Design a protein around this nucleic acid. Structure first.
Ligand SMILES: [Zn+2]
Ligand SMILES: [Zn+2]
Lengths: 458, 113, 148, 93, 128, 57, 64, 69
RNA sequence: AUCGAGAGA
DNA sequence: CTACCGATAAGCAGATCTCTCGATTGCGTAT
C-alpha cells in the first residue's frame, strides 16, 4: 500500500502524474497514464533510459554514505537483480530506449518515420517528470533517485505518509489554467482531425498533393473547426469532453452558474474552492474535517451545511493565489553562496542531509543545521527587499529532521497556483508572504500582546 | 453500537459479527487474583509477543541463514503471559520452524516463475 | 475618536459621480484577482502566454502518402501562434460588442480565435501557412480580452 | 567493488552476477566481458534486524527579542529586539 | 480531557447560581434552564462561565505533523488551551484560537447530524 | 402573432399563478447580415413580494 | 542455522520471518482472542472474552 | 434607495428631512447625532431612519435609457 | 425524458 | 484407483423527505 505520487506540471500548466508503487518482493514499479489507460514500467528501465548510467551509479545515488543500511542494500540488490533477470538484454540506454519505443508505438500514434530510439526519447520527454521538461534528463535522473530513496524511507518507517487531504500538500486549479489546458487539448484534437482527414483522402482517393494550396484548402473545409463552439459547450454544461483525459478525477460539473441573488452570494462565488464531486458520493469523513493547516488560507466558518459541508470551503479574504511564475533563475546562484554543495558532483543521499529543491528540481545537498540557517537567511533577505534574486512571494518550505515524522529537506517553491497570505515578519517589522507548506513549521502569533521571546518569528 | 449493531443483529443476522464476545460468570469462591490469572491463561498469546528482536545473518559463502531469535527476560514474559521456557521451545521446534520452512519454499517456488 | 463611522457624505458624492481615476475599494478586485490573473496569463506574460506554450509543446503530427526507405512526402501540420481577439461584430468595419449587449441579446460574449496552421511538407521543402477562424471563444469579463 | 551482497566491476561499474550462480573461477561482466576469479569473495555476510515495530506486544510497550542565525554557524547569532512601550527596534550582534 | 473537565465542573458548580448577578426566578436564563422550557445547565454554563474542552471525534483538536496544533502554539505545547480547552464564554467572547477550535467542533457536529438524519432509514423499511 | 401556416392570429399566455406587471419589452434582432422580421422579443415581469406570514427573516 | 540451495535467488528473510512470528501461536484456545476481567458492575463479577466458543469454556468449571 | 417618507416604528414623517440632513452635515460641521437632534428626531426609532439611509437612487439614476449618453 | 449544479426541514 | 463431498480463494448482485434551475449524438454522403 506504500507509494510515491508526484503531480508534475508542464510549463504550459498541464499536469502529468507519475507514481512509484512498491512491491513486497523488493521491486519498484513506475506507473503513468497516457490516454485513459494505465501503464506500468519498471523503475530501473526508465532510470537507465533517462541517461547513460551504470548500476553502480544507481546504487550510489539511491544510497548515500549509509552503505550499512541492510534494508536499503537488500531492496536495491533485489531491484537491480530483478531488472537484470527479467530483461537480460538492454545493456545500454540506446537499447532501453529502443525497447521502450517498441513497447509504445500504437498507443502514442507514432509516425512510421519515427525511429524506435526517438519514440523512446519521446515517451521519456512526455511521461517521466514532465516539469523538468526536455533537455533535463540528468535532473529527472536525480529526482527519480530522490523519489526511490524517499519510498524506501517510507517503507522503512522513517517517514510519515504525507496527507493528501491536508492543505499543507494542496494547491488550487485557478479555472483559467483549466481553460488554457482545454484549449490546448482541443487544438491538438483539431490537428489530429485534419491528419485523419488526409488519411481518409489517402485511403479513398489517390488524388493527393501535399504541396497544393487548393488541396490544403479543400481538405481543411472537410474538418471541424468550431473550437469556440466546443469551449461554449464546456462552459454551458460543465462536462469535460476529452479524448485523452486530463489529470483530474471528475468529468462533469466544472462550471457553476454565478447566481445574482445578492452581492454577498456573487462575491462568494469567486472565493470558493471545491474538493471535487468525488467526495460528495462517499462515506469516509476525514476529508471534511477542519484542519489546522487551513489557518489563514481557508475560512473556518464559511462552509455550507448539508451534503457539501467540509468540501465547498472558501478562502480567507487575504488569501492570495499566485498566477505568475516568480523570477527563480538566480536563486540557485544565491544558494551556492550560502553553502549548498552543487548537485552535480556531490554524491549524497539519505534523509540525513537537506535536499535543497527548487520547484521540483534538485539544486544541491547540505546538512540539516545549515539548511535551517539557509532557510532563515532566505526569509530574512526575502522580507528585506534588497537582494534582487529573491521575490517576496518565494515559499521557503523548509522541513526539519524529526523522529519518524515528515521527510526532511529544504523545498523552495515558486510558480502558479500557490496559496499565499500576508503575515508580519517580526524582525525589521515588514510584511511577509507564507504558504501552507512552510506555515506548519513556523510560529505565527495571533496578537502582538502574546509574542514569546525566542519563539515566534511572525 | 447503534446502527452498525442493529444492522448486524436485525438487518442481516451475520454469523460472524465484528466483536464476538461471551460473558463468563465466576464462582464466589474465586478471588480476583485467581480470576485475573485465569484470564491470562485463557487469552491467546502469539509468538511475536515474546520476541525482542530477530537477527538474520545471511551468508552465501549454499545460501544460508542464521536466524537468531531474541526474547524478553524469562521473569518478564513468563509473568506477563504465563509462558515458560519449555512451552517456548516446544512451539519454536514444532510450529514456528515448520511455518518458516513452508514460507521459504513457497517464496522459492514463486521466484522461479 | 469613533470606533466606526457612517461615511454618508463621501458615499453620496461617490454615488452621484463615480470616480474617473480608479475604482475605490481596491480590496473588491483583489478578491477576483485569481480568476482574472488566470485568464490573463493564457494570452500574455513571458514566452508569449500559456496558449503559445501549449501549441509549442503539442508539436507536429505527420502523415505520409505512400507514393514512390521511402514512404512518400510527409505532411507535418503544426501550430505556433494562437491569438485571441477582443469580441467584435460585423454590422464594413467591425465595431466593439459589450457585455451589456451580450446580456441583452441573451447570447454569449465570445471573441474570435485565430490559429495559424503550418502546412509543412517534406521536412521544410515548402510551408503553406494559413490563419483561420475557429469559432467564438468565450472570454471572461474584465480580462485583457474584454473591452472593460 | 563489493559492498554487502553486491559486487560491481572496477571499471564498468556494473553489478556482477551472483558468484555461486556462475561457473567456477570465472564470472563475466555483462558489459566489460572481464574476468574476476572467485577468490577474495569468501564471506558475503549481510546482517539484518527486525523492524523494531513489527511485533506490537504488551511487553514491548512496558519497555520582545528573537535570536536568529543568519549567514553561517561561524558568525554569531543576531538578536532582533523590539521594545513594546515605545516601538523602537534594534538588533544586537 | 478528564482533568480539564474536572476543572470545568469545579468552575460551573462554584459560579452557578451563587455567583450570578440576577437570580432565579428573575433571571430568565436560569428560569428557562431549570424550568425545562428551553436550554439546559450546559448552555447556561457555556454562556456564563466557560466553554470547556472541545472534543473532536472523541478526542481533542487535531495536531499537525510538526507537533503544533495551530500556528500560534509552539510545537508540543503542553497547555490546555493549545489542545482545545476554551476558557471563554459566549458572554465575554473567545480568542481567535478558541474560535478556530470551536469551529472545528461545530463543523463535526453539523456533519454528524447530517449523517444521522438518514443513517437509519433502511432499517425501518427492512423491518416493516 | 399571425401564423401563415394557420391563417389565424394566435396569442401566447402568461403561464404563472402569481400576477405581475410588465417591466420592459426588449426587441432583439438577429445578428445575420440580412434584415429579417422581428422574431425574438424579451418580456420582463415585476412581482410585488410584500412580506407576508410564512416567509423567513 | 538455516541453509538453502545456491541456485536460489535472494530472499528477504526478515519480512517472511516477521509474518511467521505473527502467525505462530504459543498458547491459544480456538476462537478466543483475549479474556479480560472488567470491573464488577451490577454486583456480579463477570469476564468477557473476544470470540465465542461455548464448548471450550465448559471445561473450566472450576472458575466459571 | 429613496428616503422613507414615514418612520417604520412610530410613523413620524422623516421623508422631508434627508436633504436638510445632508445640508446640515455638509455646510455646518455637525456630526450625525447633533444633526438628527436639530432636525427634530428624538426617538432612536426616528433617528435610525435618517442616520442609516443609503440613498441608492442616486446610483440607480445614472442608467437613463431615455437620454443620449 | 435523462444528468449536472444548488436550495428547504 | 477413482468418485463424491467439503472448503477456502475468487467472482457477482444490491438500497443507503420536499423544491428550483441548466443542459440535450458525431460523422458521412451522394449528389
Ligand atoms: Zn563492467
Ligand atoms: Zn420613529
Amino acid at each position: 500500500h506504500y507509494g510515491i505520487q508526484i503531480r508534475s506540471v508542464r510549463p504550459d500548466q498541464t499536469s502529468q502524474t507519475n507514481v512509484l508503487h512498491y512491491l513486497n518482493d523488493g521491486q519498484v514499479t513506475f506507473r503513468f497514464s497516457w490516454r485513459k489507460n494505465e501503464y506500468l514500467v519498471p523503475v530501473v528501465m526508465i532510470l537507465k533510459a533517462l541517461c547513460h548510467t551504470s548500476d553502480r551509479e544507481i546504487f550510489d545515488g539511491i544510497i548515500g554514505n549509509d552503505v550499512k543500511d541492510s534494508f536499503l542494500t537488500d531492496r536495491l540488490e533485489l531491484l537491480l537483480r530483478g531488472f537484470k533477470k527479467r530483461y537480460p538484454h538492454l545493456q545500454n540506454r540506446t537499447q532501453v530506449l529502443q525497447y521502450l519505443g517498441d513497447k509504445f508505438r500504437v498507443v502514442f500514434q507514432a509516425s512510421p518515420d519515427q525511429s524506435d530510439l526517438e519514440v523512446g526519447q519521446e515517451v521519456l520527454d512526455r511521461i517521466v517528470l514532465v516539469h523538468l521538461g526536455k533537455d533535463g534528463s540528468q535532473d529527472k535522473f536525480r529526482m527519480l533517485l530522490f523519489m526511490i530513496r524517499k519510498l524506501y524511507s517510507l517503507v522503512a518507517g522513517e517517514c510519515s505518509p504525507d496527507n493528501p487531504d491536508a492543505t499543507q500538500h494542496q494547491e488550487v486549479l485557478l479555472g483559467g489554467f483549466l481553460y488554457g489546458m482545454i484549449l490546448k487539448e482541443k487544438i491538438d484534437e483539431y490537428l489530429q482531425n485534419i491528419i485523419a482527414q488526409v488519411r481518409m483522402d489517402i485511403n479513398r482517393g489517390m488524388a493527393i498533393n501535399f504541396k497544393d494550396k487548393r488541396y490544403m484548402s479543400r481538405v481543411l473545409m472537410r474538418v471541424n473547426e468550431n473550437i469556440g463552439s466546443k469551449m461554449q459547450y464546456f462552459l454551458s454544461t460543465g462536462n469535460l469532453v476529452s479524448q485523452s483525459g486530463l489529470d483530474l478525477q471528475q468529468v462533469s460539473g466544472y462550471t457553476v452558474v454565478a447566481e445574482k441573488i445578492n452581492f454577498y452570494r456573487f462575491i462568494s462565488h469567486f472565493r470558493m474552492v471545491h474538493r471535487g464531486s468525488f467526495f460528495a458520493q462517499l462515506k469516509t469523513t476525514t476529508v471534511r474535517k477542519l484542519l489546522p493547516e487551513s489557518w489563514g488560507f481557508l475560512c473556518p466558518v464559511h462552509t455550507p451545511d448539508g451534503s457539501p459541508c467540509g468540501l465547498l470551503n472558501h478562502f480567507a479574504h487575504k488569501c492570495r493565489i499566485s498566477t505568475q511564475q516568480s523570477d527563480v533563475s538566480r536563486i540557485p546562484s544565491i544558494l551556492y553562496s550560502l553553502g549548498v554543495a552543487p548537485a552535480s558532483h556531490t554524491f549524497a543521499a539519505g534523509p540525513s542531509l537537506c535536499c535543497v529543491q527548487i520547484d521540483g528540481k534538485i539544486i544541491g545537498w547540505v546538512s540539516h543545521e545549515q539548511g535551517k540557517i539557509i532557510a532563515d537567511t532566505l526569509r530574512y533577505w526575502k522580507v528585506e527587499g534588497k537582494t534582487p534574486g529573491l521575490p517576496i512571494d518565494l515559499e521557503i518550505g523548509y522541513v526539519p529532521p524529526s523522529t519518524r515524522g515528515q521527510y526532511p529537506g529544504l523545498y523552495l517553491f515558486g510558480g502558479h497556483s500557490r496559496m499565499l497570505r500576508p503575515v508580519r515578519y517580526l524582525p525589521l517589522d515588514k510584511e511577509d508572504i507564507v504558504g501552507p507548506f512552510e506555515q506548519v513549521y513556523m510560529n505565527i502569533a495571533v496578537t502582538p500582546q502574546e509574542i514569546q521571546n525566542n519563539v515566534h518569528t511572525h | 453500537l447503534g446502527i452498525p449493531r442493529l444492522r448486524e443483529i436485525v438487518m442481516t443476522a451475520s454469523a460472524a459479527i465484528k466483536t464476538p464476545q461471551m460473558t463468563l460468570p465466576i464462582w464466589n469462591d474465586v478471588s480476583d487474583e485467581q480470576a485475573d490469572t485465569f484470564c491470562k491463561s485463557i487469552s491467546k498469546v502469539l509468538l511475536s509477543e515474546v520476541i525482542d528482536k530477530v537477527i538474520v545473518t545471511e551468508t552465501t559463502g549454499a545460501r544460508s541463514y542464521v536466524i537468531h531469535m531474541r526474547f524478553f527476560d524469562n521473569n518478564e514474559y513468563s509473568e506477563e503471559y504465563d509462558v515458560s521456557k519449555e512451552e517456548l521451545q516446544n512451539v519454536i521446534s514444532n510450529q514456528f520452524i515448520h511455518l518458516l520452512e513452508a514460507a521459504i519454499v513457497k517464496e522459492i517456488k514463486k521466484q522461479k516463475r | 475618536a469613533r470606533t466606526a463611522d457612517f461615511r454618508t457624505l463621501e458615499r453620496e458624492s461617490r454615488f452621484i459621480n463615480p470616480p474617473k481615476d480608479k475604482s475605490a475599494f481596491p480590496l473588491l478586485q483583489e478578491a477576483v484577482q485569481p480568476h482574472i490573473g488566470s485568464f490573463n496569463a493564457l494570452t500574455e506574460g513571458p514566452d508569449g502566454g500559456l496558449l503559445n506554450l501549449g501549441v509549442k509543446d503539442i508539436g507536429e503530427k505527420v502523415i505520409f502518402d505512400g507514393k514512390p526507405g521511402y514512404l512518400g512526402n510527409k505532411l507535418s501540420v503544426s501550430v505556433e501562434q494562437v491569438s485571441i481577439a477582443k469580441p467584435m461584430s460585423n454590422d464594413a468595419v467591425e465595431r466593439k460588442v459589450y457585455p451589456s449587449e451580450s446580456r441583452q441579446r441573451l447570447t454569449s460574449y465570445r471573441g474570435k480565435l485565430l490559429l495559424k496552421l503550418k502546412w509543412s511538407v517534406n521536412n521544410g521543402e515548402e510551408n503553406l501557412f494559413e490563419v483561420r477562424d475557429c469559432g467564438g471563444l468565450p472570454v471572461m469579463l474584465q480580462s485583457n480580452r474584454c473591452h472593460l | 567493488s563489493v559492498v554487502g551482497s553486491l559486487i560491481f566491476c572496477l571499471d564498468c561499474g556494473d553489478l556482477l552476477e551472483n558468484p555461486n550462480a556462475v561457473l567456477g573461477s570465472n564470472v563475466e561482466c555483462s558489459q566489460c566481458k572481464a574476468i574476476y576469479p572467485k577468490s577474495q569473495f569468501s564471506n558475503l555476510k549481510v546482517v539484518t534486524t527486525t523492524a523494531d515495530d513489527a511485533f506490537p506486544s504488551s511487553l514491548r510497550a512496558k519497555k520582545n527579542y528573537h535570536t536568529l542565525q543568519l549567514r553561517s554557524a561561524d558568525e554569531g547569532a543576531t538578536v532582533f529586539y523590539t521594545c513594546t512601550s515605545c516601538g523602537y527596534k534594534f538588533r544586537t550582534n | 480531557s478528564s482533568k480539564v473537565n474536572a476543572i470545568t465542573s469545579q468552575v460551573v458548580s462554584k459560579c452557578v447560581p451563587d455567583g450570578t448577578m440576577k437570580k432565579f426566578p428573575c433571571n430568565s436564563m436560569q428560569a428557562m434552564a431549570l424550568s425545562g422550557a428551553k436550554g439546559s445547565n450546559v448552555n447556561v454554563s457555556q454562556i456564563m462561565c466557560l466553554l470547556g474542552q472541545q472534543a473532536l471525534e472523541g478526542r481533542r483538536v487535531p495536531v499537525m505533523v510538526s507537533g503544533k496544533t495551530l500556528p500560534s502554539f509552539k510545537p508540543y505545547e503542553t497547555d490546555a488551551m493549545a489542545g482545545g480547552y476554551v476558557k471563554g464564554r459566549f458572554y465575554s467572547g473567545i480568542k481567535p484560537q478558541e474560535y478556530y477550535f470551536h469551529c472545528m467542533a461545530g463543523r463535526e457536529g453539523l456533519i454528524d447530524t447530517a449523517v444521522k438524519t438518514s443513517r437509519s432509514g433502511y432499517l425501518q423499511r427492512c423491518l416493516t | 402573432y399571425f401564423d401563415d401556416t394557420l391563417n389565424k392570429t394566435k396569442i401566447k399566455t402568461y403561464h404563472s399563478s402569481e400576477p405581475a406587471y410588465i417591466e420592459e419589452v426588449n426587441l432583439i434582432g438577429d445578428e445575420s447580415n440580412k434584415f429579417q422580421e422581428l422574431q425574438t422579443v424579451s418580456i420582463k415581469y415585476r412581482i410585488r413580494r410584500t412580506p407576508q406570514i410564512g416567509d423567513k427573516f | 542455522k538455516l541453509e538453502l540451495a545456491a541456485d536460489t535467488e535472494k530472499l528477504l528473510m526478515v519480512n517472511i520471518v516477521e509474518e511467521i512470528c505473527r502467525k505462530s501461536i504459543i498458547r491459544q484456545i480456538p476462537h478466543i482472542d483475549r479474556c479480560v476481567h472488567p470491573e464488577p458492575e451490577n454486583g456480579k463479577r463477570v469476564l468477557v472474552t473476544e470470540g465465542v466458543n461455548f464448548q471450550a469454556m465448559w471445561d473450566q468449571e472450576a472458575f466459571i | 434607495m429613496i428616503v422613507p417618507v414615514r418612520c417604520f416604528s412610530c410613523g413620524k414623517v422623516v421623508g422631508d428631512k434627508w436633504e436638510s440632513y445632508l445640508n446640515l452635515l455638509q455646510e455646518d460641521e455637525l456630526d450625525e447625532g447633533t444633526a438628527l437632534s436639530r432636525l427634530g428626531l428624538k426617538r432612536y426609532c426616528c433617528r435610525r431612519m435618517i442616520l442609516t439611509h443609503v440613498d441608492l437612487i442616486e446610483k440607480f439614476l445614472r442608467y437613463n435609457p431615455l437620454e443620449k449618453r
